[PDB]
Design an enzyme around this catalytic site. Structure first.
Site, short mmCIF file in Angstrom:
data_model
loop_
_atom_site.label_atom_id
_atom_site.label_comp_id
_atom_site.label_asym_id
_atom_site.label_seq_id
_atom_site.Cartn_x
_atom_site.Cartn_y
_atom_site.Cartn_z
N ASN A 187 2.53 6.92 -1.51
CA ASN A 187 3.47 6.74 -2.62
C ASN A 187 2.83 6.08 -3.87
OD1 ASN A 187 5.70 5.88 0.02
ND2 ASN A 187 5.69 7.85 -1.07
N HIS A 189 1.44 3.13 -4.08
CA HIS A 189 1.63 1.69 -4.07
C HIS A 189 0.46 1.08 -3.32
CE1 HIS A 189 5.71 1.50 -5.61
NE2 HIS A 189 5.86 2.70 -5.06
N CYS A 224 1.44 -5.97 -6.19
CA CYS A 224 0.31 -5.86 -7.10
C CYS A 224 0.38 -4.38 -7.54
CB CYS A 224 -1.01 -6.17 -6.40
SG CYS A 224 -2.49 -5.80 -7.39
#
Ligand code: O1D
Ligand code: O1D
Ligand code: O1D
Ligand code: O1D
Lengths: 265, 265
Positions: A187, A189, A224
């Site tokens: 995804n 991330h 992050c």
């Protein structure tokens, strides 16, 4: 891998790979963490989740996100060894969900490790946390044991301890850490395991060379982003115990806090 | 995995993992490269390596990669089973070659191929040398003795000379540093980490709209655990071709050079 007889847990075996081991030729804690994610995903797939969310969740744009990860390792499996991992989930009422794991040596059947994780509901778009609605719980409860089943049953155990915020100045630090594409998931991330690696980067190499990591507790406060830069901070609090803090390099916004417990070799 | 009937090659099957895939839910080129290393190590173990021959251990010599060339036709999807066959061939006194063939386990079609050139090196002084006749006699019995090439074609991409990128580079990613997960069991930076660093300077738009078809990478010098690297890329070209250069952040010492070929999705 496969669901167990009652369909309320999942087991899978993994052969430890050459690139998955550290200097002692045993799996790193990040390899173990990656295996925990893989067996978790295979469990969700086996019980009907589409290629991760229930019907009510996808309608409200909600996802499960990790709030805390706690891992205890008694023996790290060697390169070429076969490790068997069993995983299951349990409802924690309206607070959230818990996923637990048990690691065993496939040849001896002895428990070589255990893990527990606390998950909370979050809107995918606004990042706002929510409680678990009545409807969502009814949809996933049928895939969980309904009586308690805890990987860490003992009272006052390390998985439920409150972690304080590291005060400046830190004893040790590693600054300017940035994720590369291999650190991202499907995804886009940052993978939850990358944060474990970043926490460990501020532990001095001498501690790593002379001790084995026995316990790691990590709170996930904020993500992050792909273009962010992180500073990893550590202070000895003690076996050797450390207090950890990951924060954004610039403004100092906290992204994670944790503790590690190390045993002399 | 297992040696084939004649004992001159090795095959192994791998199920693609959740954390091993990118945004298209297919294995990244770094996951493929890691699988190539794993099947290579399992082949060395199956043929009796403790991987160095008797004469190599006595002279403190090791095999080191000088060049890696990978061509992917189809990246396997998350959960797919990929079968990889690997073998080695002597290249006289120059060095050794390891080749691989990747196939979809369900269809049997070739989905990729790879080739690597290895040279002998003293482990302590880092000085390259030719393959002595005593060393060759020791590993020749584990190789097909007639030619067996993963890249047979006359003027194929695997043997092309790569030029040195001239400043200024069109794109760059600065300040790249290895973390502990980037190191192998011998505390050296894993060869696959360099592939990731090369790809970091390719713009995200190219990655989002193209698939990587070919990557050729020369390994000139090692990045030490405490070194910092700069990744540089310039477009040289429906297909997009790039020229790459990895160099130390400070003095600008070259560590790698390479080329990539991308096809529009
Ligand atoms: N992304 C994912 C998928 C499946 C399980 C899962 O377990 C939680 C966890 C694993 C490893 C490190 C930190 C937290 C995470
Ligand atoms: N997003 C995600 C990723 C991996 C596992 C996962 O577990 C879902 C689940 C499986 C079995 C019972 C209850 C819930 C969710
Ligand atoms: N370290 C190692 C072990 C076994 C095979 C091997 O093949 C060469 C290679 C693989 C992946 C990327 C670059 C080069 C490398
Ligand atoms: N250092 C190393 C790592 C992985 C593989 C390897 O191959 C050795 C080999 C196997 C079979 C035939 C000829 C040579 C060497």
């Amino acid at each position: 891998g496969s669901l167990t007889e009652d369909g309320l847990s999942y087991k899978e075996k993994f052969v430890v790979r050459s690139y998955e081991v550290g200097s002692n030729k045993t799996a790193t804690v990040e390899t173990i963490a990656n295996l925990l994610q893989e067996v978790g995903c295979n469990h969700a797939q086996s019980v009907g989740f589409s290629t991760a969310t229930t019907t009510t969740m996808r309608k409200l744009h909600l996802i499960w996100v990790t709030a805390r990860m706690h891992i205890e390792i008694y023996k790290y499996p060697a390169w070429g060894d076969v490790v068997e991992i069993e995983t299951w989930c349990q409802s924690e009422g309206r607070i959230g969900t818990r996923r637990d794991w048990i690691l065993k040596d496939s040849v001896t059947g002895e428990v070589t490790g255990r893990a527990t994780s606390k998950w909370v509901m979050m809107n995918q778009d606004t990042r706002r946390l929510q409680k678990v609605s009545d409807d969502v719980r009814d949809e996933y409860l049928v895939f969980c044991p309904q009586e308690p089943r805890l990987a860490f049953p003992e009272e006052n155990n390390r998985s439920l301890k409150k972690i304080p915020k590291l005060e400046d100045p830190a004893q040790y630090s590693m600054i300017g850490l940035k994720p590369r594409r291999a650190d991202l998931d499907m995804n886009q991330h940052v993978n939850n395991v990358t944060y474990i690696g970043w926490v460990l980067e501020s532990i001095p190499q001498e501690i790593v060379d002379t001790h084995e990591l026995q316990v790691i507790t990590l709170d996930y406060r904020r993500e992050c982003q792909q273009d962010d830069v992180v500073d990893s901070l550590t202070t000895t609090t003690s076996d050797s115990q450390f207090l950890h803090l990951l924060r954004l390099s610039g403004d100092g916004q906290e992204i994670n806090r944790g503790t590690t417990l190390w045993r002399k070799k």
